Design a protein around this ligand. Structure first.
Ligand SMILES: CCCCCCCCCCCCCCCCCC(=O)OC[C@H](CO[C@@H]1O[C@H](CO[C@H]2O[C@H](CO)[C@H](O)[C@H](O)[C@H]2O)[C@H](O)[C@H](O)[C@H]1O)OC(=O)CCCCCCCCCCCCCCCCC
Ligand SMILES: CCCCCCCCCCCCCCCCCC(=O)OC[C@H](CO[C@@H]1O[C@H](CO[C@H]2O[C@H](CO)[C@H](O)[C@H](O)[C@H]2O)[C@H](O)[C@H](O)[C@H]1O)OC(=O)CCCCCCCCCCCCCCCCC
Ligand code: CLA
Ligand code: CLA
Ligand code: CLA
Ligand code: CLA
Ligand code: CLA
Ligand SMILES: CCCCCCCCCCCCCCCCCC(=O)OC[C@H](CO[C@@H]1O[C@H](CO)[C@H](O)[C@H](O)[C@H]1O)OC(=O)CCCCCCCCCCCCCCCCC
Ligand SMILES: CC1=C(/C=C/C(C)=C\C=C/C(C)=C/C=C/C=C(C)/C=C/C=C(C)/C=C/C2=C(C)CCCC2(C)C)C(C)(C)CCC1
Ligand SMILES: CC1=C(\C=C/C(C)=C/C=C/C(C)=C/C=C/C=C(C)/C=C/C=C(C)/C=C/C2=C(C)CCCC2(C)C)C(C)(C)CCC1
Ligand SMILES: CCCCCCCCCCCCO[C@@H]1O[C@H](CO)[C@@H](O[C@H]2O[C@H](CO)[C@@H](O)[C@H](O)[C@H]2O)[C@H](O)[C@H]1O
Ligand SMILES: [Ca+2]
Lengths: 37, 64, 119, 128, 36, 36, 450, 40, 102, 32, 60
């Protein structure tokens, strides 16, 4: 194939892909159906 | 030339005699500390004369 | 810029002046007899108490009265405080005629504030 | 001239100033277990041989520089330390001659060419 | 409303504490390239 | 009890006194290797 | 060709500084890039604090921690804790946020582009971590400047406006302090007090003049300790009582910063003079006395006589007596019988809370502070929840006395961890078994049997 | 600033600027011109 | 300065009122400002020997460490005992004029 | 809302503004 | 005060240009010669523009 790309680079974008979907959950405690607001 | 217990603790305070800093030395450090001291003596002479009277000094017998 | 204090003085500022006028006629009291005879820390009761409410009360000349004469009216209200700093801190001096002339200063500024600003 | 109704000299070598990060004069270190010796415990007749040697350590260094060969330093120093081991301190000589070297190469900071010559020649005096 | 006539920068200066946390995680990312 | 207080106050200053110039006399030279 | 690697220095990607122990050039770039980062939080947290601020709501309600640090020096505070000009809080952070780029330029020059060692380059800056005259000159350069910061608060005090006083007559006010306490019998005598309740060794420092007398005596010995370490060496006993390496100097300091933040986790919990309650919030010792006081004077309006009534349990419901004679507030408030805040100091009589002046001399300002301080007790949730844990989350206030007191205690205890864990490696640095015991000459097989 | 301090401070300006610097420049910039001869 | 006139380990100097009536002994506070320079304020005399003593300390701490220059040692003839005596008497006369004055 | 997305714009500009200093060094050949 | 948009809006886009271009210049030794000066025109623009938002703070 020889299309290999440095893992470290996709270690960031998978890591901040993990970070935005657990950062969205802590946004969701503060508006929505469980927020007591 | 009599050694005592006293004189074997002060002879390093009086071991040298003519050891001297080199030529012209730390003279103008002493000069600018003198010129600050004469200006300080000139200030306090006219504090007391009331000729460099300031606010809230009033050199007088109304004091503590 | 508002001249007409219809309810603005008659409910607020004529109760602003009324509460510290009420401490004022009382003030020839035990407090003068404290500095006459012999009670050191009940003056510090009075300075942070009945004179603690003479000053935290006398604080909203900003928040109710005439913002052109506001910056000249701060330091009128600051000199009444800062002379009464000498009243409570001459209690550790233990000599009650440095505090007695400090109390006579509170005649020169409190009623001079009360003579001023009917607006 | 005895007298002492006006004059007496000496000293100099102290705390004046300077900020410089230049002129690396091979830094001198003290050997461990060294203390500076007092003159009163040492003796005035014992130190008058001592202080003339300190001029004599550089007087032969000035002789060897114009001689163009460090042989006269490297032949009048071998076993001088084991001669003076009884009287003088061996540790006091190394720290004196090192700062004699370092202060001399500080005087040669302007020429930039003979300073590395005397650094070769003073190092013969230290290593011998 | 802290500023006098800035007033559109209430978005940008709200996040400005959080960037020292981002300075630590960048040191992992810089180390993820070369060194291991 | 004030008679007791000094007796307790001696023995704290004795034991802490024999801790504070315990370490002050070489305490990095009985570390069984170099400079022991 | 690379300074950093696994097998040239024996350190991995973690323990990710210890390549910089002997390398002196980029170690300066480590700290100045880090000191740019501390100033970067120091401006921007305040620049986030303002524009999340409103001036008419009180300071502690929003959960904000640096705006009450600025209000101690009185940067536009009129009287009683209301603010009048927020632009003095705008200038102080932007002189740190703009200064963080200038501090950031140095720590990125020396860590990348600058030299790797400087002993050769300057001869002033360079060190070995063994040259004992040069290493004490480094401390002497900072102590003369740390004394200059210590006289910097008192030069703000005695000349430029003044420091805020919570013991001002009329609630609280800024005032220019005209006599700091120079007598050492009281202020060095604070060090010789008991660290328990009652005496309050470094914590109970009422009459703000004693704090501003402190930084007279702090900076005038920090100057005097600054010029000592320029001129002289450590002593002969000091050469053989310490570890002299690149390590332990962090660990001597990490022992101190752990000790300093235990004190910082007690200045912000108990003291009501250096940290004012009208900016930071009331203490636990303040709010429990504020709980009983508004229920005392509530009773006065009702008219039941205070002294006669016996609580639910035999004691006085309102005014019982403490173990040493001060008539104090009753109930569960016997623990905080040492409460000396600014309100109810006009209720302190000769003995304590005197009942001649506890009746007929409560003021409407006096109760409404304690009414506010009752409901603003330090009682938090994790998130924003306030009040008792059992109570529903109707309103939010974490009371940043409490919310900053535990946050240093996370870091005060953690700095005791690493200080102990560097003191192991530093003592094994000079002893040579930082990598473990030997195969051949094991020292315990030389030891005799038990 | 007080009206007798600055009236004293103008002397320390003028007693410097009229007496001292025209003595110092008025001596050393004529003695350095007429240097004495040591070679005999 | 500090350990005798300020009440730390000692009783203070004499201080009275103006128009001297109730003059007694109490420890005076060292006043550091310009108000301590008028000699009728006793707060300068406590602030005297603290401030003159600390520069008396920093003189003699300096004066042990350095040596005089040879452009002064041959000029002031500092090896001689007599020169020092002359200097001392001259200084003393200066000190006797002020307590003739004050 | 207008100045909520410009907040999260100013997030999403500034987070990956970090690692674009790293990849630009790691592909031009700068010594990392 | 409509100038106080475009001055500080130019500051936030030129200081975003300094979070990224300064480790590039510092990072590469080979291209350092070209870039060494470019910081003194880089930061020298950023210095006098932070000075110019300072005087325009007080003027409005
Ligand atoms: C295995 C799995 C485990 C790991 C899973 C991944 C989790 C990673 C770690 C957790 C990270 C937290 C997520 C961030 C979201 C968040 O938390 O978000 C919460 C807040 C931001 O949310 C805001 O929080 C505010 C908090 O109230 C504040 O404001 C209120 C309204 O004004 C009140 O006034 C109140 O007084 C004041 O506290 C309000 O709730 C706002 O509505 C809300 O927008 O994040 C902040 O600020 C955080 C502050 C930043 C620095 C933290 C400093 C902490 C110092 C104290 C530490 C001591 C020990 C604590 C023990 C725990
Ligand atoms: C050695 C080990 C020390 C710790 C052992 C327990 C000591 C008790 C303690 O911890 O107590 C901490 C003490 C201070 O104790 C508190 O000190 C207070 C002083 O506040 C006084 O002054 C304040 C002014 O703001 C308020 O007015 C307050 O109401 C008023 O009482 C009172 O004395 C309290 O009774 C008392 O709880 O020392 C301090 O600050 C510093 C404590 C250092 C150790 C910290 C460990 C956590
Ligand atoms: C002034 C503080 C200070 C300084 C300058 C140092 C300096 C040093 N430490 Mg050290 N340390 C300190 C305090 C300090 N220590 C304290 C207080 C602790 C206890 C916690 C430690 C614990 C520690 C360990 C555990 C060891 C060192 C080591 C080292 C050396 C190598 C550093 C390294 O590679 O980092 C490595 C950095 C990391 C691996 C990053 C770790 C990230 C942590 C786990 C994050 C924790 C959570 C954090 C708060 C973020 C939370 C975010 C939130 C949203 C969840 C270096 C000399 C090493 C050594 O012996 O070398 C001499 C060693 O192995 N340190
Ligand atoms: C406070 C945090 C901090 C700081 C200041 C440093 C600083 C440093 N570390 Mg380090 N480190 C840290 C945390 C930190 N570290 C942590 C938590 C870990 C554990 C993961 C490590 C692990 C680690 C290792 C293992 C090593 C270092 C090394 C270094 C040094 C040289 C780095 C180098 O040459 O690459 C330079 C970096 C680059 C060229 C990459 C580009 C990245 C840029 C420069 C980041 C900054 C950009 C910034 C946003 C722009 C500023 C704007 C400007 C206007 C001011 C440097 C002094 C190395 C060393 O000892 O030196 C040889 C080394 O081997 N560190
Ligand atoms: C802890 C801080 C610190 C320390 C110890 C050093 C130390 C050093 N730097 Mg340096 N530097 C720093 C911070 C620091 N820097 C910062 C923050 C920057 C970014 C602006 C720089 C930028 C920098 C450059 C660009 C260079 C150095 C160089 C040097 C070295 C030579 C010293 C010299 O010739 O200066 C001579 C000293 C002066 C000319 C005096 C200047 C003093 C300042 C600017 C005046 C203001 C003082 C201030 C008011 C004091 C109060 C501080 C207060 C604001 C907190 C020296 C090792 C040089 C180097 O590495 O060698 C090639 C070099 O080229 N530095
Ligand atoms: C924080 C700044 C700082 C730092 C890091 C140092 C660091 C140092 N100083 Mg130093 N110094 C400083 C400020 C500082 N100094 C100031 C401000 C002054 C002026 C007063 C001095 C005056 C000074 C002199 C006069 C001497 C030093 C010495 C020393 C060296 C060894 C310290 C030692 O063994 O004593 C540690 C102290 C002890 C072992 C004694 C025990 C102390 C107590 C009883 C232990 C228990 C304390 C307890 C936990 C807390 C209660 C406090 C109180 C209520 C008792 C070290 C390099 C010594 C040295 O080497 O000479 C240069 C030395 O003789 N310093
Ligand atoms: C332990 C020593 C000691 C003590 C505590 C006293 C105590 C006292 N003596 Mg006394 N005395 C002593 C030793 C002592 N004496 C000795 C050894 C002598 C013989 C020289 C005398 C001779 C003596 C006389 C003749 C008299 C006293 C008197 C007194 C009383 C008042 C002192 C006074 O007015 O100050 C006045 C002191 C001074 C003005 C000090 C002069 C120093 C000048 C101002 C400065 C000199 C320049 C300075 C050294 C250099 C600059 C320093 C600068 C860098 C800081 C006082 C009770 C008086 C008395 O009758 O009491 C019974 C009195 O008349 N003393
Ligand atoms: C890619 C590969 C991934 C592999 C994962 C494999 C499965 C792993 C499953 C483990 C996680 C189980 C818990 C799920 C978390 C969750 O659902 O949160 C989902 C919740 C739900 O969020 C809620 O949504 C509601 C919607 O109306 C409400 O609005 C609420 O306000 C909101 O909070 O969000 C959170 O709890 C945030 C915290 C997340 C952190 C939880 C960590 C738990 C760790 C437990 C220990 C397990 C070990 C893990 C580490 C190894
Ligand atoms: C866990 C981990 C991970 C992950 C990570 C992440 C998820 C992230 C990272 C990182 C990052 C992501 C970082 C960031 C950074 C950033 C930065 C570094 C920044 C800079 C900037 C600045 C500092 C700013 C500036 C400014 C200002 C000041 C204001 C205005 C605006 C501007 C822009 C101008 C991985 C797996 C990979 C590896 C392992 C570890
Ligand atoms: C103004 C002020 C004040 C006052 C005063 C002061 C400032 C003081 C200081 C003081 C001090 C000054 C203290 C100190 C301390 C010390 C310490 C803390 C030390 C420690 C150390 C240690 C503990 C160690 C030891 C050791 C050991 C054990 C071993 C070895 C040997 C040795 C010795 C080293 C106050 C507080 C009121 C408040 C505010 C400020
Ligand atoms: C390094 C030396 C320090 C120089 C500064 C010295 C400051 C002055 C020291 C005396 C301090 C104040 O002096 C005295 O303090 C005591 C303390 O009980 C009070 O009593 C006195 O009323 C006051 O006169
Ligand atoms: Ca913002």
């Amino acid at each position: 194939g020889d299309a290999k790309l440095p893992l470290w680079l996709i270690a960031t974008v998978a890591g901040t892909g993990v970070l935005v979907v657990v950062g969205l959950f802590f946004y969701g405690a503060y508006v929505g159906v469980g927020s007591a607001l | 030339a009599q050694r005592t217990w006293l004189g074997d603790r002060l002879r390093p305070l009086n071991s040298e005699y003519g050891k001297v800093a080199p030529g012209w030395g730390t003279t103008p450090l002493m000069g600018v500390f003198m010129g600050l001291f004469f200006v300080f003596l000139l200030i306090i002479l006219q504090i007391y004369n009331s000729s460099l009277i300031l606010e809230n000094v009033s050199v007088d017998w109304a004091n503590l | 810029e508002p001249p007409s204090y219809s309810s603005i003085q008659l409910e607020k500022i004529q109760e602003y002046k009324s509460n510290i006028v009420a401490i004022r006629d009382r003030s020839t009291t035990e407090l003068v007899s404290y500095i006459q005879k012999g009670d050191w820390i009940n003056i510090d009761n009075f300075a942070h108490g009945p004179f603690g409410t003479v000053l935290q009360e006398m604080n909203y000349v900003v928040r109710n009265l005439l913002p052109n004469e506001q910056p000249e009216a701060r330091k009128l209200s600051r000199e009444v405080f800062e002379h009464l700093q000498d009243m409570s801190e001459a209690a550790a001096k233990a000599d009650r005629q440095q505090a007695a002339i400090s109390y006579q200063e509170a005649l020169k500024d409190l009623d001079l504030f009360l003579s001023k600003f009917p607006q | 001239i005895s007298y002492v109704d006006n004059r007496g000299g000496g000293f100099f070598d102290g705390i004046k100033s300077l900020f410089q990060d230049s002129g690396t004069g091979p830094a001198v270190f003290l050997p461990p277990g060294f203390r500076p010796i007092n003159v009163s415990r040492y003796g005035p007749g014992n130190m008058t041989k001592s202080l003339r040697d300190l001029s004599w350590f550089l007087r032969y260094t000035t002789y060897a520089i114009v001689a163009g060969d460090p042989n006269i330093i490297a032949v009048n120093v071998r076993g001088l330390r084991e001669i003076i081991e009884n009287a003088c301190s061996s540790a006091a000589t190394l720290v004196a001659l090192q700062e004699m070297r370092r202060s001399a190469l500080g005087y040669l900071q302007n020429d930039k060419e003979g300073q590395e010559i005397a650094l070769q020649y003073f190092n013969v005096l230290i290593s011998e | 409303k802290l500023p006098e006539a800035y007033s559109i920068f209430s978005p940008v200066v709200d996040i400005l504490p959080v960037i020292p946390v981002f300075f630590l995680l960048l040191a992992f990312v810089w180390q993820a390239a070369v060194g291991f | 009890m004030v008679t007791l207080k000094i007796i307790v106050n001696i023995v704290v200053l004795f034991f802490v006194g024999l801790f504070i110039f315990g370490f002050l006399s070489n305490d990095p030279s009985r570390n069984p290797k170099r400079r022991d | 060709l690379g300074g950093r690697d696994q097998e040239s220095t024996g350190f991995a990607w973690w323990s990710g500084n210890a390549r910089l122990i002997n390398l002196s050039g980029k170690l300066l770039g480590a700290h100045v890039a880090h000191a740019g980062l501390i100033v970067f939080w120091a401006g921007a947290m305040t620049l986030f604090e303002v524009s999340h601020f409103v001036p008419e709501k009180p300071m502690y309600e929003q959960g904000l921690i640096l705006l009450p640090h600025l209000a101690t020096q009185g940067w536009g505070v009129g009287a009683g804790g209301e603010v009048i000009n927020t632009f003095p809080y705008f200038v102080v952070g932007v002189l740190h946020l703009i200064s963080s780029a200038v501090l950031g330029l140095g720590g990125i020059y020396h860590a990348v582009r600058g030299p790797e060692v400087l002993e050769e380059y300057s001869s002033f800056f360079g060190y070995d971590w063994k040259d004992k005259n040069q290493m004490t000159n480094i401390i002497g350069y900072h102590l003369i400047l740390l004394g200059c910061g210590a006289l910097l608060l008192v030069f703000k005090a005695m000349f430029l406006g003044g420091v805020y006083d919570t013991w001002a007559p009329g609630g609280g006010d800024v005032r220019i302090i005209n006599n700091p306490t120079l007598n050492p019998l009281v202020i060095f005598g604070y060090l010789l007090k008991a660290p328990f309740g009652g005496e309050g060794w470094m914590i109970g420092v009422d009459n703000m003049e004693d704090i501003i007398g402190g930084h007279i005596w702090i900076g005038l010995i920090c100057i005097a300790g600054g010029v000592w370490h320029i001129l002289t060496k450590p002593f002969g006993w000091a050469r053989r009582a310490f570890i002299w390496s690149g390590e332990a100097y962090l660990s001597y300091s990490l022992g101190a910063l752990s000790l300093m933040a235990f004190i910082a986790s007690a200045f912000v919990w108990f003291n009501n003079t250096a940290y004012p309650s009208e900016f930071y919030g009331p203490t636990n010792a303040e709010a429990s006395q504020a709980q009983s006081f508004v229920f005392l004077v509530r009773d006065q309006k009702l008219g039941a006589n205070i002294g006669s009534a016996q609580g639910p349990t035999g004691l006085g419901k309102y005014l019982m007596r403490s173990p040493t004679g001060e008539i104090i507030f009753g109930g569960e408030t016997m623990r905080f019988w040492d409460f000396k805040g600014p309100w109810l100091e006009p209720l302190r009589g000769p003995n304590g809370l005197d009942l001649n002046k506890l009746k007929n001399d409560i003021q409407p300002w006096q109760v409404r502070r304690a009414a506010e301080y009752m409901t603003h007790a330090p009682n938090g949730s994790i998130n924003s929840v306030g009040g008792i844990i059992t109570e529903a989350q109707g309103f939010n206030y974490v009371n940043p006395r409490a919310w900053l007191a535990a946050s240093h205690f996370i870091l005060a205890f953690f700095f005791l961890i690493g200080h102990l864990w560097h003191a192991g490696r530093a003592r094994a640095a000079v002893a040579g078994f930082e990598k473990g015991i030997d195969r051949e000459t094991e020292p315990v097989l030389a030891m005799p049997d038990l | 600033m007080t009206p007798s301090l600055m009236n004293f401070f103008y002397s320390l300006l003028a007693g410097l600027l009229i007496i001292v610097v025209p003595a110092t420049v008025g001596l050393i910039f004529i003695s350095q011109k007429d240097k004495i001869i040591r070679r005999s | 300065g500090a350990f005798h006139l300020t009440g730390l380990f000692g009783p203070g100097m004499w201080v009275s009122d103006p128009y001297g009536l109730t003059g007694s002994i109490q420890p005076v506070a060292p006043s550091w400002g310009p108000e301590g320079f008028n000699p009728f304020n006793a707060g300068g005399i406590a602030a005297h020997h603290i401030a003159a003593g600390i520069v008396g300390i920093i003189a003699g701490l300096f004066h042990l460490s350095v040596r005089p220059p040879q452009r002064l040692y041959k000029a002031l003839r500092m090896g001689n005992i007599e020169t020092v005596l002359s200097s001392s008497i001259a200084a003393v006369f200066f000190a006797a004029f002020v307590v003739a004055g004050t | 809302n207008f100045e909520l997305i410009a907040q999260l714009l100013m997030l999403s500009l500034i987070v990956i503004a970090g690692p674009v200093v790293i990849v630009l060094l790691a592909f031009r050949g700068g010594d990392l | 005060t409509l100038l106080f948009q475009v001055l500080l809006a130019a500051l936030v886009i030129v200081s975003f240009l300094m979070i990224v271009a300064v480790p590039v210049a510092y990072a590469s030794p080979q291209n350092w010669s070209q870039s060494k000066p470019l910081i003194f025109i880089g930061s020298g623009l950023w210095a006098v523009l932070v000075i110019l938002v300072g005087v325009f703070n007080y003027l409005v």
